[PDB]
Every structure is written in structure tokens, then in C-alpha cells.
Design a protein around this ligand. Structure first.
Ligand SMILES: [Mn+2]
Length: 173
């Protein structure tokens, strides 16, 4: 009774090979992390965004920038927050471990902060992560942790689990 559930469902019923089911699994993963994002933004009263290009953020905080003199990498973090002195580069994980978080922390560290350091914008990269089994939230970014001590999120990942479970049940061999 939700488009996302029924569109994944139809796709799980139809899928016939493991090479194609892996793309469905990747699709659910990103869908689970989008819903985390929406709820997190609603819970935090910041505007919702997903996969925004670096160039667009730069030009929303800093419209006068002489862009073409900078090598601005093509990265798309999920969202950002501009305070007037600090640029919070946001990112949504949902996971039960921290490995993927560390990957995206390193990539976004070396790919974003160099150019922001030349433009002169105080940047910090923030990965918020929800454990989907236990619902605990883990935050990286001391400035984000400060600006938001209470994260009042109401999550439920059950539809995502049922989906990724049916996919595993179909290919348990
Ligand atoms: Mn993303």
C-alpha cells in the first residue's frame, strides 16, 4: 500500500538471477537511507535534500564565488546546513556497523575540504547513522553534535527488512 514497497515487491517477485537481485538490494539500501534522511530532517527542522552536488552548495552559501578558478570535485553529499560561519556537510547512513561510514568520511574529507579551504568556507563533514535493528543514532561532526544534542527521530525500518528478507529467502542458494 506504499508505492516504494509495492514497486520493490513487484521487482522481487519478477527477479530471476542473483546478478539482477543485487541491484534491487542496492536499491533498498538507498531507499532505507532516504527515509532515514526525511525523518531526520523532519525531526530536526532542517530542509530536506538528497545527493546535492558540491558546486550547488558552494553557490548557495557563496553566490559571489569566482567559481571557474577552482577545481571543484563532482561529489553529491545528501544535504548541508549553512549557519553563517560554518558549513555542515550532511550525509545519511543506515547500517549496523561503521565501515561504510568511515569510507564516506574519508572520501568526503579529501574531496570536499581541500577546495572549501581555498574558497575560505569553514567546512565540517557530518555523517549521521541509524542502526536499523536497534534504532540508535551515531553522529560524526562535533559541530553537528553541538548544534543538535537531542535527535528526536521516530523511525521504523520493518518494511525495508521484509523486502531485503524476501530477496534473501529467494536466493538462499
Ligand atoms: Mn547519498
Amino acid at each position: 500500500e506504499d508505492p516504494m514497497y509495492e514497486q520493490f515487491l513487484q521487482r522481487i517477485q519478477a527477479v530471476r538471477t542473483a546478478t539482477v537481485a543485487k541491484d534491487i538490494s542496492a536499491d533498498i539500501l538507498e531507499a532505507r537511507a532516504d527515509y532515514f534522511g526525511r525523518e531526520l530532517c523532519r525531526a530536526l527542522d532542517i530542509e530536506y535534500r538528497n545527493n546535492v552536488l558540491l558546486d550547488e552548495i558552494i553557490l548557495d552559501v557563496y553566490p559571489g564565488v569566482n567559481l571557474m578558478e577552482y577545481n571543484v570535485p563532482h561529489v553529491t553529499p545528501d544535504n548541508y546546513i549553512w549557519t553563517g560561519d560554518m558549513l555542515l556537510i550532511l550525509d545519511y547512513k543506515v547500517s549496523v556497523g561503521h565501515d561504510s561510514t568511515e569510507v564516506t568520511y574519508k572520501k568526503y574529507t579529501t574531496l570536499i575540504l581541500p577546495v572549501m579551504q581555498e574558497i575560505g568556507i569553514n567546512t565540517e563533514i557530518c555523517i549521521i547513522r541509524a542502526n536499523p535493528v536497534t534504532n540508535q543514532i551515531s553522529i560524526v561532526g562535533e559541530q553537528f553534535k553541538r548544534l543538535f544534542p537531542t535527535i528526536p527521530v521516530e523511525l521504523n525500518f520493518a518494511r525495508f527488512f521484509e523486502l531485503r528478507k524476501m530477496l534473501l529467502d529467494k536466493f538462499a542458494d
